[PDB]
Design a protein around this ligand. Structure first.
Ligand SMILES: COc1cc2c(c(OC)c1OC)-c1ccc(OC)c(=O)cc1[C@@H](NC(C)=O)CC2
Ligand code: NA
Length: 133
């Protein structure tokens, strides 16, 4: 009997950050999203949980990828912006929104991680209010 000791929880492959066949553009709005929005958030004291995919093995979180089927993180967004993966700013904004929403879904309103996400989301909304027209 193995008693399933080998069936450990693993991480899914991370989201795609490069695809030569996807339509992409560099727009002024996307350049602002990299240079101002992403760079500002990256340096925030609460950014660290969001700078890479959730590692279910390190964090002992066998349920995470059962609940969250569209994961997103800022490391992925950074690589997408640097690799010019996006066609327009709304595609990138959607990724930020997914990242925040995932955190609110998985956790509960009083939790420290949710206060961290809310602080980042506040700063995100401040910065995209000045998105170039
Ligand atoms: C045992 O230590 C940690 C364990 C976890 C997390 C975490 O980062 C704050 C830890 O600190 C290193 C954690 C990480 C990221 C999350 O989303 C980005 C999340 O939704 C949720 C979490 C954690 N949830 C809570 C309520 O903080 C659970 C897993
Ligand atoms: Na929740």
């Amino acid at each position: 009997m193995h008693h399933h000791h080998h069936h450990m929880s693993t991480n899914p492959p991370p989201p795609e950050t490069s695809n030569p066949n996807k339509p992409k553009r560099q727009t002024n709005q996307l350049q602002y999203l990299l240079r101002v929005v992403l760079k500002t958030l990256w340096k925030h004291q609460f950014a660290w949980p969001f700078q890479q995919p959730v590692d279910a093995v390190k964090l002992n979180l066998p349920d995470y990828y059962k609940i969250i089927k569209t994961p997103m993180d800022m490391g992925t967004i950074k690589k997408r912006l640097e690799n010019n993966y996006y066609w327009n700013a709304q595609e990138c904004i959607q990724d930020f929104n997914t990242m925040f929403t995932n955190c609110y879904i998985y956790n509960k309103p009083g939790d420290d991680i949710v206060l961290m996400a809310e602080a980042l989301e506040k700063l995100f909304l401040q910065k995209i209010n000045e998105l170039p027209t």
